[PDB]
């Protein structure tokens, strides 16, 4: 419109792909490793956690 | 954080004329997530 | 089609129809006029075995240049057919091989 | 040597159907892939398809798949049949191999690939006429 | 100053509808145009 205009969006160049997150499965593991551990204090000693 | 965001978002541009028919086909020409959408808007005038 | 004239020696470049509309994989083939036709050059760097190096291909900077051929130093056995089959991402299945360009060589003692 | 004989009719009238084989010595039938391909004079190459080891044709779009291929692993031939011969059949058939190319642009986990086909060794083809000439 | 120009401008009427299509021909005689255009009323 008068003093209006909107940002769209144009052609998305190069091959149509999607946006992706990549965590270290070894760091994720250990950091997992020592969350279960204080829940496992938190909640009774040892016990079964599936996250 | 509220107030904050909302103060920055007022004096920005108002999208109130794109509610409209979206004439809307796909992207992948082969085997959605990307929409190619063709509309009306009204220009300057 | 498209009749290329070249002058013997040196270089020349042919490139073909199609826009590379995302990534491409291009395939180039040589359609001699009358016997079976070869291929030269594919994944945009891999040339096959028994090709003379006179033939290089264009590596893939993900943008800007197209499916480029280069003929350096054309002799009297590249009179045939070249062929560009693109296999851009975009376009989905590269089901069509595309069209036909011809190089006829001039200056040819 | 994989030599790929094709034998036809050579004669044909319109609107009935067509044979022609695809045989191969030298090597073997179950290590790759092999298709056809076809040439018209005036035009450029065209493709019937391509058959694989699950044989499942898949058939031309651009020819209303009113053709009909196959193989046969007893005589080791390529099989191709063209039922309703249409008067634009005149042209040369060759006979096509067929590498499962593989071109990766992203990762093999959400399919963001796609397979591209690598041709390497051709055929020699025949021509055929379809008119009441014979 | 600045500031004050924007907050008086403000209350005051917007004309964001006269951007239309001025069918616009030379005055009776440039410096001034006669032009004629469409607005819309109160309904
Ligand atoms: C996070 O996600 C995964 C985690 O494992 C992984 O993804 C990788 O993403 C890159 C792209 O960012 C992929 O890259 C392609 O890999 C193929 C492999 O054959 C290449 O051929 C591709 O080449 C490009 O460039 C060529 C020349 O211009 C082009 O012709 C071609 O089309 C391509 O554009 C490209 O490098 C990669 O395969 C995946 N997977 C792996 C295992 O690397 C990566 O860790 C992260 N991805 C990111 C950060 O984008
Ligand atoms: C979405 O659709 C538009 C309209 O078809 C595409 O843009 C046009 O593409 C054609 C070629 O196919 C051009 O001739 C036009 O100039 C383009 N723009 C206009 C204003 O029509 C656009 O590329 C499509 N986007 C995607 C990613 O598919
Ligand atoms: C944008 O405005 C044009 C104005 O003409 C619309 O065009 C008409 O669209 C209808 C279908 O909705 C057709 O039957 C008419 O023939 C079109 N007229 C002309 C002259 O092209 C168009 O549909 C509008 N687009 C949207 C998304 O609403
Ligand atoms: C600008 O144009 C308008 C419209 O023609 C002029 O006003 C009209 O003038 C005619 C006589 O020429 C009168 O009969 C009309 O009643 C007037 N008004 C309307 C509503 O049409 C106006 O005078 C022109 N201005 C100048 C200075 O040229
Ligand atoms: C105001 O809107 C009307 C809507 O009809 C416009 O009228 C048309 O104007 C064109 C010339 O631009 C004429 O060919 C038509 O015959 C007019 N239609 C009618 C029903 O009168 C008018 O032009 C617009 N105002 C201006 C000054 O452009
Ligand atoms: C994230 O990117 C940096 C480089 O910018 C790299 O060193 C690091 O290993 C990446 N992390 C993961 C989990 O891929
Ligand atoms: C395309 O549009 C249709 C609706 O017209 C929708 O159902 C479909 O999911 C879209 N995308 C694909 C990949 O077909
Ligand atoms: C009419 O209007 C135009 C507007 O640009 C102006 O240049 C011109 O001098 C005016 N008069 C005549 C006689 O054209």
């Known amino acids: 419109g008068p003093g209006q205009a909107f940002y769209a969006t144009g052609d998305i160049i190069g091959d149509i792909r999607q946006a992706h997150c990549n965590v270290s499965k070894a760091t994720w593991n250990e950091t997992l490793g020592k969350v279960v551990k204080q829940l496992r204090k938190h909640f009774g000693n040892n016990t079964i956690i599936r996250f | 954080i509220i107030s904050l965001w909302d103060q920055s978002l007022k004096p920005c541009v108002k999208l109130t004329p794109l509610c409209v028919t979206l004439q809307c086909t796909n992207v992948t020409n082969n085997i959605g997530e990307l929409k190619n959408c063709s509309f009306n808007m009204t220009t300057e005038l | 089609v498209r009749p290329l004239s070249v002058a013997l020696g040196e270089t020349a470049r042919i490139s073909c129809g199609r826009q590379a509309l995302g990534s491409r994989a291009v395939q180039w083939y040589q359609h001699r006029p009358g016997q079976a036709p070869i291929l030269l050059i594919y994944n945009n760097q891999d040339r096959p075995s028994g090709i003379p190096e006179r033939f290089s291909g264009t590596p893939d900077i993900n943008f800007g240049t197209r499916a480029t051929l280069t003929i350096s130093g054309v002799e009297a056995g590249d009179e045939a057919d070249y062929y560009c089959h693109m296999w851009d991402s975009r376009s989905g299945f590269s089901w069509s091989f595309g069209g036909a360009t011809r190089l006829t060589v001039l200056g040819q003692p | 040597q994989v030599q790929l004989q094709e034998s036809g009719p050579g004669l044909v009238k319109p609107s009935e159907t067509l044979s022609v084989t695809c045989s191969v010595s030298?090597?073997?039938?179950?290590?790759?892939?092999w298709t056809w391909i076809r040439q018209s004079p005036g035009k450029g190459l065209e493709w019937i398809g391509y058959i694989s080891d699950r044989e499942s044709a898949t058939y031309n779009p651009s020819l209303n798949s009113r053709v009909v291929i196959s193989r046969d692993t007893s005589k080791n031939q390529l099989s191709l049949k063209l039922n309703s011969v249409t008067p634009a059949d005149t042209a040369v058939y060759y006979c096509a191999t067929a590498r499962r190319g593989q071109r990766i642009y992203g990762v093999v986990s959400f399919g963001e690939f796609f397979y591209y086909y690598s041709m390497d060794v051709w055929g020699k083809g025949t021509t055929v006429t379809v008119s009441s000439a014979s | 100053i600045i500031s004050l120009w924007d907050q008086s401008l403000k209350p005051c009427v917007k004309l964001t509808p006269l951007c239309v299509t001025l069918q616009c021909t030379n005055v009776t005689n440039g410096e001034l145009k006669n032009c004629s255009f469409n607005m819309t009323t109160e309904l």
């Open positions: 030298g090597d073997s039938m179950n290590n790759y892939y």
